[PDB]
Amino acid sequence: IHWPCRLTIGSNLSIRIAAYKSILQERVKKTWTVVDAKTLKKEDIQKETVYCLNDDDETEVLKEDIIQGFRYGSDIVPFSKVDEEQMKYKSEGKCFSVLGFCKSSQVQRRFFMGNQVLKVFAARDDEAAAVALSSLIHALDDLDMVAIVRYAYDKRANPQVGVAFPHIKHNYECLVYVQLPFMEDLRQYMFSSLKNSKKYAPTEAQLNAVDALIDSMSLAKKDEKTDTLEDLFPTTKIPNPRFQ
Amino acid sequence: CPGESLINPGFKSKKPAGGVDFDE
Amino acid sequence: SGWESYYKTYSGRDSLIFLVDASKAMFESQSEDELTPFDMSIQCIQSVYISKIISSDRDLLAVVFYGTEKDKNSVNFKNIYVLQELDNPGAKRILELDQFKGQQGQKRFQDMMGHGSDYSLSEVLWVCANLFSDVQFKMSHKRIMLFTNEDNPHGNDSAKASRARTKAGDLRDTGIFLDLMHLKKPGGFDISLFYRDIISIAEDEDLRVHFEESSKLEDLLRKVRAKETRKRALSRLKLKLNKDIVISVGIYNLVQKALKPPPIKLYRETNEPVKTKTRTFNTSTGGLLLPSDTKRSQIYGSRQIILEKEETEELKRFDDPGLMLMGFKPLVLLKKHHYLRPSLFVYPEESLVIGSSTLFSALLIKCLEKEVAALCRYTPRRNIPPYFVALVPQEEELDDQKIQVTPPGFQLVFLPFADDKRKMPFTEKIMATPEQVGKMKAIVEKLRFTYRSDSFENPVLQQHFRNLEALALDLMEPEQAVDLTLPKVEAMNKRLGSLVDEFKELVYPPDYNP
Amino acid sequence: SNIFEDVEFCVMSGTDSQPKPDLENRIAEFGGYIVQNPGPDTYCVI
């Protein structure tokens, strides 16, 4: 199913676009139901949740006397659901806006976040959107720059910042969008360098052996010296064995 | 060590997110 | 040869103690339209408290005042008042400190503690050492930040200065790091006069006379709202180049989604945490039912397939957890758009297996030289289907400041399976004319900007933290964080004077209503 | 007292003269039912 929206560079230029989930993790569509061993009926088995206080008598508390709360460093701060909704960060749903354009080398794939990749084409019918998106894609490809866009599936969905980059092929072209991290997501970990570690310095013979192993275990080959690599082990075309 | 946050030692101090800053 | 040749020859939690002068010199302010030095100290303390509450609530903080008529401490040293002992930060401590924030707060300070009383530094350092020793948790760091605006408090006695010097040396030897946040002083503040022998580390340019308040105050006042997690290995797996060749490696996540803190349930009346308990019992028997007596069932068109829990777990068993290496793939074949999951980081361990670091380093060096990535099957834990991943070598990088920015190791990227990809509808390829491409290139160039990995902030998380802080501290209203993610279309329109209209005329026919 | 009982009161921010804890203690002294947060059975919130 296509997700329709508008790519908005500013308050005057808007291009109607449709996005599809190009890549998505595949999970089992059918769940597992719990049944009793003696009798194979799910009706008999049922789940009940009981809430009690931290007291000797273990007084039971009704579902209507529970309030949502958060921890604030050894201090408990009540925060009602209605209060959360009232003070929740509101946003304009179904928005696809361009914040700017940055050099492709600046954005590294190691920072890609999220669990999906989107492919954006022009609207289904109109040709003006098609030509506009084609011009934008060609400009980005020629200048080797990628757009930093704001993505929001709907008003409920939390807004995110992602990178949209051109993708041009012999038969179709589009914009590939992948989410980018926030400053909170980044982790600052320090790892000791291995190049200058004297005790971890392999000798020439070790390097030669590793090189020989790498050469002997190549998964790519030369297609009759025609400047076209051939993949011997294309893992991308192997169905998930778990389903089978 | 230079560039170390004074709040949490051992972690790298980071300047506030400047958002989008168009160039000249 | 006789008796000649046969004989030869990250952990714990950070802590911090605030030391604030109580002399009258700290209370007077230079002219109006300015904040008195003690007020600056209190503001910095409150900002540090909030930053610690958000970033790392497991740290310990303490507040001690000296030079007061009253005294309070575990040793009864005069003119020493430990307002707050080393304990986890909380909203109550911030509210208590807020009492002295205002001018009436200053009067409350004067009435409840006094001022102008003589003091000796050695006593202050003694109480600080006692406070450090009192706590039992492991102490990764021990820091004492002294807030004062006096160069040489013992300007008339040398014995007191010698005692302070020896005690500072003793504390430095014990592993306590001392910093000084010098505040405003009419004449001028110099660190070389008296504190040269107290500060644990002296900067390259610090002996000069300082007129403006300490620069570290600006950093302290800069509140940071982002949870901080210490370095930790997600798993310690066993890379297997062969059934016999094996090396232990550690897996980390350099990028991880930052979710808001989980909520809990509180009893409305007493406002205390409640316990959550779940159980299952037979609808007829009405007795406790264990998972063993249950079974897993699935229905497929009037047919029920039933398996035990152990059988369901066995369904997914393929191989033992770890990384089973395979041949090497050129980096070109790793398509950028073939992104499935956030990448991980693989580093040597050298603990579980001795000699793995050298092999990993050799592999990294030769992979970088040959520009190839190690394709391998990956099983994070037992009873998990395997997934094909690629280890691309990472070259260590450092900036002009010689601070690490890209740790060395392998970047593990998950390669999607055939079923992970999705088919797409046919779309006719339409080519834009060169003039349109040129106009759009002009627009793109006009809207160029440098992108940094930490150039944006999660608006939802920031708003949630601000709301929680406002409620905890009973702020009148919660500060509205500026949403940096917004396109700030005003500047965009200003830059695009007439480019948008020209492009629309070129590419959008006259009859079109987006 | 016997007139101020079986009533659900709620205090969240007292006056400067009587901070919240002491004010709640005074309310309890009269026999009122104090609730830390409002609910579906509450006469009013102070």
mmCIF file of C-alpha atoms in Angstrom, chain C residues 30-271:
data_model
loop_
_atom_site.group_PDB
_atom_site.id
_atom_site.type_symbol
_atom_site.label_atom_id
_atom_site.label_comp_id
_atom_site.label_asym_id
_atom_site.label_seq_id
_atom_site.Cartn_x
_atom_site.Cartn_y
_atom_site.Cartn_z
ATOM 1 C CA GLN C 30 29.448 44.722 41.780
ATOM 2 C CA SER C 31 26.878 47.332 40.734
ATOM 3 C CA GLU C 32 23.288 46.438 39.835
ATOM 4 C CA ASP C 33 22.009 44.489 36.808
ATOM 5 C CA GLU C 34 24.233 41.627 37.969
ATOM 6 C CA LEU C 35 23.941 38.426 39.993
ATOM 7 C CA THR C 36 25.898 38.005 43.215
ATOM 8 C CA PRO C 37 28.606 35.295 43.171
ATOM 9 C CA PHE C 38 26.789 33.091 45.693
ATOM 10 C CA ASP C 39 23.712 33.186 43.466
ATOM 11 C CA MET C 40 25.872 32.055 40.539
ATOM 12 C CA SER C 41 27.186 29.185 42.662
ATOM 13 C CA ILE C 42 23.639 28.144 43.579
ATOM 14 C CA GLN C 43 22.520 28.346 39.940
ATOM 15 C CA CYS C 44 25.441 26.161 38.855
ATOM 16 C CA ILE C 45 24.685 23.653 41.617
ATOM 17 C CA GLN C 46 21.027 23.446 40.578
ATOM 18 C CA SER C 47 21.924 23.052 36.898
ATOM 19 C CA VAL C 48 24.391 20.275 37.732
ATOM 20 C CA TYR C 49 21.735 18.593 39.878
ATOM 21 C CA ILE C 50 19.209 18.614 37.025
ATOM 22 C CA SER C 51 21.811 17.409 34.521
ATOM 23 C CA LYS C 52 22.768 14.552 36.844
ATOM 24 C CA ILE C 53 19.116 13.660 37.442
ATOM 25 C CA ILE C 54 18.493 13.299 33.710
ATOM 26 C CA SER C 55 21.809 11.972 32.371
ATOM 27 C CA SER C 56 22.782 9.612 35.212
ATOM 28 C CA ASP C 57 20.669 9.328 38.364
ATOM 29 C CA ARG C 58 23.000 6.741 39.947
ATOM 30 C CA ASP C 59 25.740 9.301 40.659
ATOM 31 C CA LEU C 60 26.331 10.842 44.088
ATOM 32 C CA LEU C 61 26.302 14.558 44.905
ATOM 33 C CA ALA C 62 26.920 16.497 48.111
ATOM 34 C CA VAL C 63 26.747 20.146 49.174
ATOM 35 C CA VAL C 64 28.917 21.554 51.979
ATOM 36 C CA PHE C 65 29.176 25.156 53.197
ATOM 37 C CA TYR C 66 32.054 26.656 55.186
ATOM 38 C CA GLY C 67 32.580 29.994 56.892
ATOM 39 C CA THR C 68 29.258 29.918 58.737
ATOM 40 C CA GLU C 69 28.417 30.556 62.379
ATOM 41 C CA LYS C 70 26.592 27.225 62.607
ATOM 42 C CA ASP C 71 28.264 23.868 62.030
ATOM 43 C CA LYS C 72 27.087 20.354 61.195
ATOM 44 C CA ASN C 73 29.094 17.255 60.265
ATOM 45 C CA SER C 74 29.963 13.761 61.470
ATOM 46 C CA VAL C 75 33.146 15.085 63.135
ATOM 47 C CA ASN C 76 31.848 18.377 64.644
ATOM 48 C CA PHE C 77 34.536 20.547 63.034
ATOM 49 C CA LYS C 78 33.671 24.189 63.655
ATOM 50 C CA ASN C 79 32.465 26.498 60.869
ATOM 51 C CA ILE C 80 31.648 23.427 58.736
ATOM 52 C CA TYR C 81 28.067 22.673 57.664
ATOM 53 C CA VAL C 82 27.377 19.665 55.422
ATOM 54 C CA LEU C 83 24.018 20.736 54.016
ATOM 55 C CA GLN C 84 23.627 17.556 51.938
ATOM 56 C CA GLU C 85 25.655 14.373 52.325
ATOM 57 C CA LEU C 86 26.685 12.212 49.374
ATOM 58 C CA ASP C 87 23.472 10.676 48.025
ATOM 59 C CA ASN C 88 21.652 10.133 44.757
ATOM 60 C CA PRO C 89 20.252 13.407 43.358
ATOM 61 C CA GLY C 90 16.553 14.069 43.793
ATOM 62 C CA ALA C 91 13.910 16.724 43.310
ATOM 63 C CA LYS C 92 13.733 17.304 47.070
ATOM 64 C CA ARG C 93 17.393 18.353 47.181
ATOM 65 C CA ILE C 94 16.869 20.813 44.319
ATOM 66 C CA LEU C 95 13.807 22.261 46.051
ATOM 67 C CA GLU C 96 15.780 22.610 49.291
ATOM 68 C CA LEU C 97 18.589 24.416 47.465
ATOM 69 C CA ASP C 98 15.979 26.659 45.822
ATOM 70 C CA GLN C 99 15.360 28.252 49.232
ATOM 71 C CA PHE C 100 18.572 30.300 48.967
ATOM 72 C CA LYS C 101 18.028 31.123 45.276
ATOM 73 C CA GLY C 102 16.230 34.413 45.906
ATOM 74 C CA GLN C 103 17.230 37.526 47.809
ATOM 75 C CA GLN C 104 14.920 36.407 50.603
ATOM 76 C CA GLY C 105 16.850 33.170 50.189
ATOM 77 C CA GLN C 106 20.049 35.110 50.847
ATOM 78 C CA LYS C 107 18.502 36.569 54.002
ATOM 79 C CA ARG C 108 17.449 33.062 55.051
ATOM 80 C CA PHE C 109 21.043 31.919 54.524
ATOM 81 C CA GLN C 110 22.317 34.778 56.682
ATOM 82 C CA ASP C 111 19.810 34.089 59.465
ATOM 83 C CA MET C 112 20.074 30.278 59.511
ATOM 84 C CA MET C 113 23.848 29.899 58.987
ATOM 85 C CA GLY C 114 25.517 33.285 59.504
ATOM 86 C CA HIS C 115 28.529 34.627 57.649
ATOM 87 C CA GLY C 116 31.931 36.212 58.154
ATOM 88 C CA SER C 117 33.221 33.509 60.507
ATOM 89 C CA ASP C 118 36.886 32.573 60.244
ATOM 90 C CA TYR C 119 37.752 29.174 58.796
ATOM 91 C CA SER C 120 40.691 26.919 57.960
ATOM 92 C CA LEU C 121 40.891 25.000 54.691
ATOM 93 C CA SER C 122 42.349 21.866 56.299
ATOM 94 C CA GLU C 123 39.099 21.432 58.237
ATOM 95 C CA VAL C 124 37.075 21.674 55.014
ATOM 96 C CA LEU C 125 39.260 19.105 53.261
ATOM 97 C CA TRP C 126 38.989 16.829 56.313
ATOM 98 C CA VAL C 127 35.189 16.923 56.211
ATOM 99 C CA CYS C 128 35.243 16.332 52.446
ATOM 100 C CA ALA C 129 37.485 13.281 52.865
ATOM 101 C CA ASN C 130 35.219 11.964 55.622
ATOM 102 C CA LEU C 131 32.187 12.403 53.359
ATOM 103 C CA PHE C 132 33.956 10.513 50.572
ATOM 104 C CA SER C 133 34.875 7.691 52.958
ATOM 105 C CA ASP C 134 31.359 7.466 54.418
ATOM 106 C CA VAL C 135 29.691 6.058 51.296
ATOM 107 C CA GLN C 136 30.110 2.370 50.441
ATOM 108 C CA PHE C 137 29.421 2.187 46.694
ATOM 109 C CA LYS C 138 32.389 1.798 44.366
ATOM 110 C CA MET C 139 33.850 5.206 43.512
ATOM 111 C CA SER C 140 34.922 5.477 39.873
ATOM 112 C CA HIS C 141 35.740 9.172 40.351
ATOM 113 C CA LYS C 142 36.061 11.533 43.316
ATOM 114 C CA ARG C 143 35.752 15.250 42.573
ATOM 115 C CA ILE C 144 35.654 18.356 44.768
ATOM 116 C CA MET C 145 34.650 21.635 43.101
ATOM 117 C CA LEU C 146 35.341 24.671 45.290
ATOM 118 C CA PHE C 147 33.217 27.759 44.592
ATOM 119 C CA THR C 148 34.968 30.821 46.014
ATOM 120 C CA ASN C 149 36.056 34.347 45.105
ATOM 121 C CA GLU C 150 39.099 34.651 47.396
ATOM 122 C CA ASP C 151 42.700 34.176 46.275
ATOM 123 C CA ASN C 152 44.514 33.618 49.599
ATOM 124 C CA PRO C 153 42.036 33.296 52.489
ATOM 125 C CA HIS C 154 44.945 32.778 54.914
ATOM 126 C CA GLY C 155 46.656 36.052 54.082
ATOM 127 C CA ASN C 156 47.805 36.564 57.682
ATOM 128 C CA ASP C 157 48.690 33.043 58.906
ATOM 129 C CA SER C 158 51.231 30.633 57.418
ATOM 130 C CA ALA C 159 50.470 27.595 59.595
ATOM 131 C CA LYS C 160 46.923 27.423 58.223
ATOM 132 C CA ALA C 161 48.239 27.672 54.659
ATOM 133 C CA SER C 162 50.759 24.892 55.311
ATOM 134 C CA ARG C 163 48.039 22.689 56.815
ATOM 135 C CA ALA C 164 45.816 23.298 53.789
ATOM 136 C CA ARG C 165 48.695 22.521 51.418
ATOM 137 C CA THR C 166 49.582 19.243 53.129
ATOM 138 C CA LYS C 167 45.937 18.166 53.275
ATOM 139 C CA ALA C 168 45.439 19.008 49.596
ATOM 140 C CA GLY C 169 48.501 16.927 48.767
ATOM 141 C CA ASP C 170 47.188 14.034 50.854
ATOM 142 C CA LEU C 171 43.785 14.144 49.154
ATOM 143 C CA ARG C 172 45.405 14.324 45.714
ATOM 144 C CA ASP C 173 47.496 11.273 46.614
ATOM 145 C CA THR C 174 44.407 9.385 47.803
ATOM 146 C CA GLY C 175 42.834 9.904 44.369
ATOM 147 C CA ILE C 176 40.657 13.001 44.801
ATOM 148 C CA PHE C 177 40.530 15.572 41.996
ATOM 149 C CA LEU C 178 40.071 19.206 43.038
ATOM 150 C CA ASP C 179 38.838 22.031 40.804
ATOM 151 C CA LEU C 180 38.247 25.714 41.553
ATOM 152 C CA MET C 181 35.412 27.809 40.097
ATOM 153 C CA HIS C 182 36.703 31.297 40.825
ATOM 154 C CA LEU C 183 33.942 33.914 40.772
ATOM 155 C CA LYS C 184 33.906 37.697 40.416
ATOM 156 C CA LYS C 185 36.231 39.809 42.557
ATOM 157 C CA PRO C 186 36.556 43.611 42.145
ATOM 158 C CA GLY C 187 40.352 43.731 42.115
ATOM 159 C CA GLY C 188 41.239 40.512 40.325
ATOM 160 C CA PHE C 189 41.449 36.757 40.895
ATOM 161 C CA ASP C 190 44.785 34.966 40.481
ATOM 162 C CA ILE C 191 45.301 31.232 40.952
ATOM 163 C CA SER C 192 49.103 31.252 41.317
ATOM 164 C CA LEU C 193 49.063 33.220 44.588
ATOM 165 C CA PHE C 194 47.757 30.473 46.889
ATOM 166 C CA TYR C 195 45.916 27.747 44.953
ATOM 167 C CA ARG C 196 48.877 26.745 42.762
ATOM 168 C CA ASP C 197 49.691 24.037 45.330
ATOM 169 C CA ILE C 198 46.067 22.877 45.754
ATOM 170 C CA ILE C 199 44.672 22.403 42.238
ATOM 171 C CA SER C 200 45.298 18.824 41.141
ATOM 172 C CA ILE C 201 45.951 19.775 37.496
ATOM 173 C CA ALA C 202 47.131 23.167 36.228
ATOM 174 C CA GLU C 203 46.099 24.152 32.712
ATOM 175 C CA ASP C 204 48.556 25.433 30.119
ATOM 176 C CA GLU C 205 47.481 29.074 30.642
ATOM 177 C CA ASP C 206 46.133 29.521 34.176
ATOM 178 C CA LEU C 207 48.792 31.492 36.102
ATOM 179 C CA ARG C 208 47.533 34.772 34.621
ATOM 180 C CA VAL C 209 45.299 37.107 36.609
ATOM 181 C CA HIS C 210 41.633 36.306 35.961
ATOM 182 C CA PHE C 211 39.136 39.185 35.874
ATOM 183 C CA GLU C 212 36.006 37.618 34.381
ATOM 184 C CA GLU C 213 34.262 34.771 36.177
ATOM 185 C CA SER C 214 35.478 31.241 35.512
ATOM 186 C CA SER C 215 34.741 29.863 32.052
ATOM 187 C CA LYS C 216 33.644 26.501 33.485
ATOM 188 C CA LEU C 217 30.590 28.271 34.930
ATOM 189 C CA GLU C 218 29.136 28.656 31.433
ATOM 190 C CA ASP C 219 29.563 24.931 30.774
ATOM 191 C CA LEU C 220 28.020 24.041 34.140
ATOM 192 C CA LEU C 221 25.004 26.289 33.531
ATOM 193 C CA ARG C 222 24.483 24.584 30.145
ATOM 194 C CA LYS C 223 21.853 22.007 31.065
ATOM 195 C CA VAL C 224 22.106 18.681 29.229
ATOM 196 C CA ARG C 225 19.021 16.469 28.823
ATOM 197 C CA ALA C 226 20.139 13.086 27.489
ATOM 198 C CA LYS C 227 20.474 9.734 29.234
ATOM 199 C CA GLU C 228 24.102 8.594 29.426
ATOM 200 C CA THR C 229 25.055 4.906 29.412
ATOM 201 C CA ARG C 230 28.527 3.629 30.249
ATOM 202 C CA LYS C 231 30.371 1.400 27.802
ATOM 203 C CA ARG C 232 28.901 -2.102 27.905
ATOM 204 C CA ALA C 233 29.120 -5.149 25.645
ATOM 205 C CA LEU C 234 25.773 -6.432 24.396
ATOM 206 C CA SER C 235 27.278 -9.902 23.972
ATOM 207 C CA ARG C 236 30.602 -11.744 24.020
ATOM 208 C CA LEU C 237 30.365 -13.946 20.936
ATOM 209 C CA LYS C 238 32.837 -16.372 19.351
ATOM 210 C CA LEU C 239 33.826 -15.662 15.754
ATOM 211 C CA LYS C 240 34.661 -18.947 14.006
ATOM 212 C CA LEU C 241 36.851 -18.751 10.913
ATOM 213 C CA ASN C 242 36.792 -22.564 11.094
ATOM 214 C CA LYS C 243 35.609 -25.363 13.358
ATOM 215 C CA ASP C 244 39.055 -25.175 15.008
ATOM 216 C CA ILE C 245 40.028 -21.506 14.564
ATOM 217 C CA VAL C 246 38.029 -19.323 16.956
ATOM 218 C CA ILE C 247 38.383 -15.856 18.490
ATOM 219 C CA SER C 248 36.255 -14.186 21.156
ATOM 220 C CA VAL C 249 34.799 -10.787 20.241
ATOM 221 C CA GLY C 250 32.544 -8.241 21.925
ATOM 222 C CA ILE C 251 29.480 -6.637 20.338
ATOM 223 C CA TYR C 252 28.375 -3.076 21.122
ATOM 224 C CA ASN C 253 25.703 -0.696 19.816
ATOM 225 C CA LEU C 254 27.127 2.707 18.898
ATOM 226 C CA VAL C 255 23.647 3.894 17.846
ATOM 227 C CA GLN C 256 20.626 2.931 19.949
ATOM 228 C CA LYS C 257 17.096 4.311 19.978
ATOM 229 C CA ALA C 258 16.492 6.581 22.978
ATOM 230 C CA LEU C 259 13.097 5.708 24.451
ATOM 231 C CA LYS C 260 11.440 7.697 27.206
ATOM 232 C CA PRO C 261 11.753 6.175 30.698
ATOM 233 C CA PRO C 262 9.147 3.449 31.249
ATOM 234 C CA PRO C 263 6.135 4.467 33.353
ATOM 235 C CA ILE C 264 4.897 2.654 36.453
ATOM 236 C CA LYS C 265 1.668 2.371 38.435
ATOM 237 C CA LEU C 266 1.088 4.339 41.646
ATOM 238 C CA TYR C 267 -1.727 4.059 44.163
ATOM 239 C CA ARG C 268 -3.833 7.207 43.905
ATOM 240 C CA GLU C 269 -4.518 7.591 47.630
ATOM 241 C CA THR C 270 -1.063 7.112 49.165
ATOM 242 C CA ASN C 271 0.923 7.764 45.955
#
